[PDB]
């Protein structure tokens, strides 16, 4: 509620209004504080969900999901600091403003009270993200990532507004989710498929199916300095949750056609992870993880029958961190050596000993050792999706193999002798290198102690 948007918009002139170089520490100081407010009135119910205003129930829903969104902001200025210190302050004042200008809508969205505040705010980004990709790129291939990032996201999300304005005047008012207490079903026709297909395909083009992901590595391979907005674009994607607000209801009873979204993404899950093994560019190698065990949720959501939402929620915020943090490693190791080519960096682990245990705990949580959230987020997937049909144990059982050769080959490539020609790579990871790389593995594993705070209603 205004408890949140108002201070975080109050942030906005906490920055430029300041002096010279004090700016970074000025806003990083406050931006942490809001996290007390983040929890503050939140983590109330529980049962019979919280709605505190007419057009906002901040998050009740058991999709808390908002606490993270308020984390990643003052993880950027620790992240983004590296080469952004080399241009002017009135531009550096900008890049902190639009970056907030993103953070303000992700608080608006995830609440939205309804469908039609979601959408205009579901499309309300792409103004702030697109401007961070095109400027402050690195290569010159960036200019095409500008377009491809649109012309999909916007391409098929217009058929929403044709459909959601079609519901508003058909049955009552969509003004509120919390009233669905009248919903008739959707039986069949050659019209209703389209309705269901229009109310869906806009979401898929964000969390990729194995088709129409053609943009995802185009934008991430070449993308701002620190992953500065690349950490944010790994929040944006998973935020396609809203399919959890719809497909639970609002055409419940068409599962009839589900199968082309099952067998299409269920054989890609065994697939695009395997086209990730021979990659020669590291920020590509991680970008294809992000498809894979993200695209497993799309077979979690379509199937009804909780024990999937038990396991589908834990995943949106499962790689929400692990897949975040890897883009933070591959950034750092790139500061020192200016190729992103994976081969070139070898013979590390002697020269940066403390950063050894940083790779490991990262690459260990794609392996998903049993105790952490990762498996307890996957093993509620397999338990329901097994009951669907027994044969799902094979493919998604293969996923649990190729992903293990997948991860290690990234670490074990950095255990070798190489002294080779590098006179660079002196800096022994000054604190920010290891400070911002923490505040992930500390908060991540921690939740396993009381992991009832990440769960759906079911």
């Amino acid at each position: 509620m205004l408890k949140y948007i108002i201070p975080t918009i109050m942030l906005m002139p906490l920055t430029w209004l300041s002096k010279n170089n004090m700016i970074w520490v000025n806003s990083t100081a406050h931006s942490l504080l809001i996290s007390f407010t983040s929890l503050l009135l939140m983590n109330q119910f529980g049962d019979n969900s919280l709605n505190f205003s007419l057009l906002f129930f901040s998050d009740s829903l058991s999709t808390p999901l908002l606490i993270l969104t308020m984390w990643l902001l003052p993880l950027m200025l620790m992240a983004s600091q590296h080469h952004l210190s080399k241009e002017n302050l009135t531009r550096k004042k900008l890049f902190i403003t639009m970056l907030i200008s993103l953070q303000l809508f992700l608080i608006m969205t995830f609440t939205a009270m309804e469908l039609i505040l979601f959408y205009i705010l579901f499309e309300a980004t792409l103004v702030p993200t697109l401007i961070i990709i095109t400027r402050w790129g690195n290569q010159t291939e960036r200019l095409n990532a500008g377009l491809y990032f649109l012309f999909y996201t916007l391409a098929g999300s217009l058929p929403l507004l044709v459909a959601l304005i079609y519901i508003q005047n058909t049955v009552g008012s969509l003004n509120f989710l919390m009233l669905q207490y009248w919903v008739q079903p959707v039986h069949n026709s050659w019209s209703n498929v389209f309705m269901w297909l229009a109310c869906m395909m806009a979401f898929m083009v964000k969390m990729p199916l194995y088709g129409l992901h053609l943009w995802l590595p185009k934008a991430h391979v070449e993308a701002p300095i620190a992953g500065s907005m690349v950490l944010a674009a790994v929040l944006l994607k998973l935020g396609g949750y809203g399919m959890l607000r719809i497909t639970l209801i609002l055409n419940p009873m068409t599962d009839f056609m589900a199968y082309p979204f099952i067998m299409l993404s269920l054989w890609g899950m065994i697939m695009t992870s395997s086209i990730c093994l021979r990659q020669t560019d590291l920020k590509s190698l991680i970008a294809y993880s992000s498809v894979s065990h993200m695209a497993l949720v799309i077979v979690a959501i379509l199937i009804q029958t909780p024990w999937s939402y038990m396991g589908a929620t834990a995943l949106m915020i499962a790689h929400g961190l692990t897949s975040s943090m890897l883009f933070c490693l591959a950034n750092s190791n790139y500061e020192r050596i200016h190729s992103r080519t994976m081969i070139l960096a070898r013979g590390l682990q002697t020269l940066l000993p403390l950063m050894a245990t940083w790779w490991l705990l990262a690459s260990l949580t794609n392996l998903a050792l049993p105790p952490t959230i990762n498996l307890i987020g996957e093993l509620f997937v397999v338990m329901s999706t097994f009951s669907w049909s027994n044969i799902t144990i094979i493919l998604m059982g293969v996923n649990m193999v190729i992903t293990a050769l997948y991860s290690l080959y990234m670490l074990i490539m950095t255990q070798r002798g190489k002294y080779t020609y590098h006179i660079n790579n002196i800096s022994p990871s000054f604190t920010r290198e290891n400070a911002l790389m923490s505040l992930h593995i500390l908060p991540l594993l921690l939740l396993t102690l009381n992991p009832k705070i990440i769960l759906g209603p079911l």
Partner: protein, 113 residues
């Protein structure tokens, strides 16, 4: 409506009116308050606070006008309604009274997984 080419007729006496401290009227001229700050910046003022005689007279203008315009908007949505009920009231043949049925009655589909 009637009394054509009138900004507002005499019949608007019976409306509240829309007095101040509404967020919009404040917001109105806010978008002007971020307008004034522009007005300097285009020419290399280079003040970012320049003469308060340009940096004001905007805020004065908008909210006055924003106000003087909101007085009729709220009107219009009233004459819209007023002409509806008074039609909905007559021709009751076009407006049925639905019956009352709880569920001892309705069947749905019924299609679980």
């Amino acid at each position: 409506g009637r009394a054509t080419f009138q900004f507002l007729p005499d019949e608007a006496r019976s409306l509240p009116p829309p007095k101040l401290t509404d967020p919009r009227l404040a917001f109105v001229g806010f978008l002007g308050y971020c307008s004034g700050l522009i007005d300097n910046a285009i020419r290399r003022r280079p003040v970012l606070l320049a003469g308060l005689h340009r940096q004001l007279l905007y805020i004065t203008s908008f909210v006055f006008v924003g106000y003087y315009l909101l007085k009729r908007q709220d009107y219009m949505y009233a004459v819209r309604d007023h002409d509806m009920f008074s039609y909905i009231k007559s021709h009751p043949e076009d407006f049925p009274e639905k019956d009352k049925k709880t569920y001892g009655e309705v069947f749905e589909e019924f299609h679980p997984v």
